[PDB]
Amino acid sequence: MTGAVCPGSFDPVTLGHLDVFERAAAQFDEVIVAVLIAGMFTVDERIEMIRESTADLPNLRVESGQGLLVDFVRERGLNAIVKGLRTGTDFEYELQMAQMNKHIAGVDTFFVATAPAYSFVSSSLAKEVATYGGDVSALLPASVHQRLLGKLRG
Amino acid sequence: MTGAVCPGSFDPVTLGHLDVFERAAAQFDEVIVAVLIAGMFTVDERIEMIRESTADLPNLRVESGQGLLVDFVRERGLNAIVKGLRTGTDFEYELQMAQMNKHIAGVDTFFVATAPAYSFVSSSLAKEVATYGGDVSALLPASVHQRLLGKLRG
Amino acid sequence: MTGAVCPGSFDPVTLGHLDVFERAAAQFDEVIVAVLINPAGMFTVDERIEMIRESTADLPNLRVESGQGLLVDFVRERGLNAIVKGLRTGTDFEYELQMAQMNKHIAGVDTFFVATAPAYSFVSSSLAKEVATYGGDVSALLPASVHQRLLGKLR
Amino acid sequence: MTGAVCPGSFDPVTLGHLDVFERAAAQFDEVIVAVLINPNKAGMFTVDERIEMIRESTADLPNLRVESGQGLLVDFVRERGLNAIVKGLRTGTDFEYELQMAQMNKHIAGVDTFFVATAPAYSFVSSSLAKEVATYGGDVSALLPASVHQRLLGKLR
Amino acid sequence: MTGAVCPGSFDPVTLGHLDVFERAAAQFDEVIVAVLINPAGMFTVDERIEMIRESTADLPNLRVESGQGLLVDFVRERGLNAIVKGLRTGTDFEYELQMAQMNKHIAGVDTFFVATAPAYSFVSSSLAKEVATYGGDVSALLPASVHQRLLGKLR
Amino acid sequence: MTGAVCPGSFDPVTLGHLDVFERAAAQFDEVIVAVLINPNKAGMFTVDERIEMIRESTADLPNLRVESGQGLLVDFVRERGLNAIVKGLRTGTDFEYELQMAQMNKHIAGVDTFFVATAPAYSFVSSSLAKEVATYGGDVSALLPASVHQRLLGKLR
Ligand SMILES: O=C(O)c1cnn(-c2ccccc2)c1OCCCc1c[nH]c2ccccc12
Numbered sequence: 001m002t003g004a005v006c007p008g009s010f011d012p013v014t015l016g017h018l019d020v021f022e023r024a025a026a027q028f029d030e031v032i033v034a035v036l037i038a039g040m041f042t043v044d045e046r047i048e049m050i051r052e053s054t055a056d057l058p059n060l061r062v063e064s065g066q067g068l069l070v071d072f073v074r075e076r077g078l079n080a081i082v083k084g085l086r087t088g089t090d091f092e093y094e095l096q097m098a099q100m101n102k103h104i105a106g107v108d109t110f111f112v113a114t115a116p117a118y119s120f121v122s123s124s125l126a127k128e129v130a131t132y133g134g135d136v137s138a139l140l141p142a143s144v145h146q147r148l149l150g151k152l153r154g
Numbered sequence: 155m156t157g158a159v160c161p162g163s164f165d166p167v168t169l170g171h172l173d174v175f176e177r178a179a180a181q182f183d184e185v186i187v188a189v190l191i192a193g194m195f196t197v198d199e200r201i202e203m204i205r206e207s208t209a210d211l212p213n214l215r216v217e218s219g220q221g222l223l224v225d226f227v228r229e230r231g232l233n234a235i236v237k238g239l240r241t242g243t244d245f246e247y248e249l250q251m252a253q254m255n256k257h258i259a260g261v262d263t264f265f266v267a268t269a270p271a272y273s274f275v276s277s278s279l280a281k282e283v284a285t286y287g288g289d290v291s292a293l294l295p296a297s298v299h300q301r302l303l304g305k306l307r308g
Numbered sequence: 309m310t311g312a313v314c315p316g317s318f319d320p321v322t323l324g325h326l327d328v329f330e331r332a333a334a335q336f337d338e339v340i341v342a343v344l345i346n347p348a349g350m351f352t353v354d355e356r357i358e359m360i361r362e363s364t365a366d367l368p369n370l371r372v373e374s375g376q377g378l379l380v381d382f383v384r385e386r387g388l389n390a391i392v393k394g395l396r397t398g399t400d401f402e403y404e405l406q407m408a409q410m411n412k413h414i415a416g417v418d419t420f421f422v423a424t425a426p427a428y429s430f431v432s433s434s435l436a437k438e439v440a441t442y443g444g445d446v447s448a449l450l451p452a453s454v455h456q457r458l459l460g461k462l463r
Numbered sequence: 464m465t466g467a468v469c470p471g472s473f474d475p476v477t478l479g480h481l482d483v484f485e486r487a488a489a490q491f492d493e494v495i496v497a498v499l500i501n502p503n504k505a506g507m508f509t510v511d512e513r514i515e516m517i518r519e520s521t522a523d524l525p526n527l528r529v530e531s532g533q534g535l536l537v538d539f540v541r542e543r544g545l546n547a548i549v550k551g552l553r554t555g556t557d558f559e560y561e562l563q564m565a566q567m568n569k570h571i572a573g574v575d576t577f578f579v580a581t582a583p584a585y586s587f588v589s590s591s592l593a594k595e596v597a598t599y600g601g602d603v604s605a606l607l608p609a610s611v612h613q614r615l616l617g618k619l620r
Numbered sequence: 621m622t623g624a625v626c627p628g629s630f631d632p633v634t635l636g637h638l639d640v641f642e643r644a645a646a647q648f649d650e651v652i653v654a655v656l657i658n659p660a661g662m663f664t665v666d667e668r669i670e671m672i673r674e675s676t677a678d679l680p681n682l683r684v685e686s687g688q689g690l691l692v693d694f695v696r697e698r699g700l701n702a703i704v705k706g707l708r709t710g711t712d713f714e715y716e717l718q719m720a721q722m723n724k725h726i727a728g729v730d731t732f733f734v735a736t737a738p739a740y741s742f743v744s745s746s747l748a749k750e751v752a753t754y755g756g757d758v759s760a761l762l763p764a765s766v767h768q769r770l771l772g773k774l775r
Numbered sequence: 776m777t778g779a780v781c782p783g784s785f786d787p788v789t790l791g792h793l794d795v796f797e798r799a800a801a802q803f804d805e806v807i808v809a810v811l812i813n814p815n816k817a818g819m820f821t822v823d824e825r826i827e828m829i830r831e832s833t834a835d836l837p838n839l840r841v842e843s844g845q846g847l848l849v850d851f852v853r854e855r856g857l858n859a860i861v862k863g864l865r866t867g868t869d870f871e872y873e874l875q876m877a878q879m880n881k882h883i884a885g886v887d888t889f890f891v892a893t894a895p896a897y898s899f900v901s902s903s904l905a906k907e908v909a910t911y912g913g914d915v916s917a918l919l920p921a922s923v924h925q926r927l928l929g930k931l932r
């Protein structure tokens with residue numbers, strides 16, 4: 001009965017996120033992606049985009065969440081969070097959060113290293129570049145990319 | 155059938171290591187501590203010290219290993235490594251190793267953040283301080299500490 | 309006479325801050341804790357000052373004042389020319405190194421740092437407040453007097 | 464005819480920036496300083512002011528010119544038939560941030576980025592910190608070129 | 621005429637190095653790859669030079685030489701005063717920033733850095749050799765010519 | 776009577792070190808520079824040489840003295856009735872490494888450590904790099920005090 005929560009805003013989910021989802025799903029019996037809730041896509045849109053890109057992962061589900069992440073995790077009978085890390089700044093910031101979360105609620109955090117190909121990817125740089133007409137199609141799931149193009153045109 | 159290998163030299167195992175062992179054992183169905191093999195304690199001594207301190211963790215075992223870590227992991231039917239991280243330097247160094255290991259063999263690596271109380275602990279600083287008569291008893295399992303005192307006197 | 313100013317917003321003061329206060333007061337003849345008045349937080353400056361005074365009652369050579377504007381002015385106006393504070397992380401170091409070099413360049417005021425106590429390395433006032441707001445227990449990260457008053461503000 | 468674009472807000476240009484301008488101009492046939500403007504947020508200095516301050520302190524660099532722009536930097540670069548960006552780095556944060564931007568820029572447009580290490584004397588200098596210090600009366604005259612210091616004091620008054 | 625020296629041990633040259641060679645040669649009128657002779661490695665300096673020449677056959681403005689002693693001397697003796705190399709990580713940056721500032725201080729020679737290609741950020745010669753020694757497949761990290769010769773040395 | 780120990784190998788002392796000595800002496804009633812010797816590995820300079828070079832460049836610091844030692848630094852500190860260490864930091868690596876040592880030293884002995892930021896001009900200076908550069912003929916005269924430079928050249932000859 002192993003399991004972990006993979007939290008984020010996912011606005012939108014990137015290939016970097018998706019790689020981490022697949023990797024977590026390969027090592028834990030269940031994975032819950034927690035979409036935390038002022039951006040480009042609505043929560044429902046974000047959830048939909050993630051569900052579409054994770055159809056091939058049977059043991060993964062997607063939910064929205066509010067308030068303390070550790071409460072979200074414990075209310076579901078789990079006590080692990082899983083996330084990817086790209087940079088030293090990611091590590092420093094997430095280590096702080098991980099130690100606070102373990103202190104207040106006993107919830108642990110597991111990190112994985114980014115895929116090298118996606119180390120420079122963020123949802124906010126991808127949206128920014130796309131806005132000015134840069135090609136970010138190699139950084140996003142094919143579905144998400146189309147949804148993005150739609151948002152910028154409308 | 156989840157599982158991970160927790161590798162290191164463990165010369166000697168510290169409370170920092172032990173905390174990570176317990177945390178990995180809580181989230182994976184099996185954990186193998188892999189003692190990799192020019193220090194203070196022999197491999198057998200290191201294994202013994204770890205086994206003594208992990209008697210309360212039923213799903214953990216301890217083995218020696220040589221050669222490529224990813225071969226050790228795959229020869230045992232696993233494809234995950236688990237380790238703790240204390241510092242930014244830990245993160246940078248281990249990220250490199252993790253990406254190389256995933257590239258050559260598909261073996262993934264999961265990291266956890268050090269317990270705050272042990273963030274400054276290394277086996278080499280503990281041995282060094284103890285050599286000159288500093289009290290490191292709060293940083294090492296009670297068993298290990300006694301074994302250390304014995305090594306310095308003999 | 310040796311001395312240093314220990315600056316911050318302290319909204320609220322944490323056990324991390326308090327540890328640094330004690331360690332500074334152990335080494336300098338006088339320490340002045342300077343509570344910065346900004347544009348904004350949870351506690352008023354007077355509330356912050358009282359919480360620090362309660363927590364530092366056993367440090368006779370430490371006093372608490374509010375300040376604003378250029379810190380190196382605050383320091384020099386009190387006949388001192390040293391700042392003291394703690395560092396938790398690499399980002400603390402990078403950020404504070406820049407500020408320290410700027411402060412020494414513009415005014416000749418030096419800055420001394422101490423490493424955080426390991427137990428409080430992950431603590432910040434903002435994160436403590438955030439956690440407490442959603443019901444998390446941060447009582448082991450704050451002095452007793454502060455935790456009570458924090459519960460009061462969240463109600 | 465080698466060339467690079469040196470981008471920034473330059474609000475205002477500092478001695479750290481100018482040091483990099485000089486070093487870039489010594490190694491590329493032409494250098495274009497690109498004053499990148501956010502049309503949605505004004506800085507302290509207008510685009511004309513920023514350009515003027517840079518020109519006045521780079522008069523002895525014959526192969527350097529100054530132009531403003533907005534939008535994607537890689538478009539500014541390619542529209543001039545170049546494909547190199549050059550800038551300085553002071554800290555580990557600069558390196559992390561600029562490596563991400565450089566990798567993104569090469570990915571989307573094939574434009575490369577060259578970095579130089581800050582002169583040690585100016586490693587702590589930023590436009591924002593200089594402006595902030597000066598706002599409260601601190602002396603930043605040794606961190607900024609003559610073309611800047613008094614105009615900056617003028618804005619603050 | 622613009623130009624730069626690209627220094628290293630290249631024992632062996634990797635696809636990471638090669639990417640930087642190509643990017644330097646695209647921007648400078650000439651590039652000199654300088655293979656450092658040390659106290660020690662797997663390949664002789666002549667072997668290293670030949671492997672680089674094979675991999676850089678399509679870069680007409682890049683040449684390969686060996687060198688020893690003070691790098692800024694090597695650079696200036698060839699009428700240049702720029703060094704160029706890649707950076708993978710924060711430790712690369714910290715280390716190379718120190719060396720660059722020292723090299724500019726002592727000789728006026730400047731240093732230009734490029735960011736690693738993301739695909740090769742984790743690559744080092746030492747780690748590639750270590751992995752290959754115990755049978756790991758590093759063929760996607762090295763140029764074709766190098767991988768063959770590496771297999772030869774491990775037998 | 777406040778006081779701190781400023782430890783190091785000082786093989787040789789640099790201008791970066793001396794800057795820290797001065798700043799420490801300005802803020803503590805007494806400063807003891809501790810020349811820590813590894814009895815199992817000699818450096819370039821003997822203990823007497825290292826001490827001599829430090830004394831010659833600190834003659835105008837009346838509250839500073841120089842002593843050698845070995846073994847645990849916290850014992851050196853406590854045997855003098857002090858419980859503070861003071862030193863400089865230049866880089867993020869220095870901070871990571873020294874924070875570990877400081878936390879270990881306070882844990883085992885209650886001795887505290889105070890750090891100051893390097894002077895920007897000397898941030899890239901180390902004794903090892905200076906020695907290495909000088910070995911191959913590089914000019915490090917601006918990085919080292921007069922008391923050091925020619926003795927260093929003498930050792931290399
Ligand atoms: O920050 C972003 O916008 C963003 C977009 N893509 N990636 C990414 C890029 C490369 C690799 C893994 C993600 C990002 O980095 C976020 C890293 C922190 C993180 C928080 N929650 C997560 C859930 C799964 C994976 C990572 C995280």
Ligand SMILES: O=C(O)c1cnn(-c2ccccc2)c1OCCCc1c[nH]c2ccccc12
Nearest residue numbers: 161162168170171174238268272275276277278
């Ligand atoms: O490096 C050491 O000697 C040493 C001694 N104790 N700790 C430690 C201190 C605090 C927390 C977890 C360990 C150390 O840091 C090692 C960190 C990398 C690591 C490699 N293998 C591991 C297996 C389990 C846990 C960590 C590792």
Ligand SMILES: O=C(O)c1cnn(-c2ccccc2)c1OCCCc1c[nH]c2ccccc12
Nearest residue numbers: 315316322324325328393394424428431432433
């Ligand atoms: O940033 C915060 O909100 C916050 C809350 N607690 N601590 C802390 C946590 C652990 C140890 C020492 C403080 C924090 O870190 C601030 C670190 C920078 C600093 C600025 N002024 C200071 C005055 C005294 C001490 C530190 C500082």
Ligand SMILES: O=C(O)c1cnn(-c2ccccc2)c1OCCCc1c[nH]c2ccccc12
Nearest residue numbers: 470471477479480483550551581585588589590
């Ligand atoms: O960020 C600032 O406001 C600011 C003011 N001065 N300097 C500086 C300080 C010391 C050395 C080189 C600059 C700064 O750092 C910016 C570093 C990144 C950078 C982006 N574009 C650039 C163009 C030329 C040079 C640097 C950059």
Ligand SMILES: O=C(O)c1cnn(-c2ccccc2)c1OCCCc1c[nH]c2ccccc12
Nearest residue numbers: 627628634636637640705706736740743744745
């Ligand atoms: O350190 C190594 O063994 C090694 C093997 N491959 N790469 C590499 C990996 C990815 C990208 C560029 C190189 C390495 O990183 C070295 C980075 C520093 C560097 C010094 N001299 C250089 C010359 C050209 C390029 C880089 C350097």
Ligand SMILES: O=C(O)c1cnn(-c2ccccc2)c1OCCCc1c[nH]c2ccccc12
Nearest residue numbers: 782783789791792795862863893897900901902
């Ligand atoms: O590491 C070196 O060899 C070396 C030579 N000069 N500097 C230096 C360069 C710039 C500024 C302050 C020193 C060095 O950096 C050491 C930094 C850590 C340190 C340990 N003990 C010290 C005592 C006084 C000052 C610093 C230290």
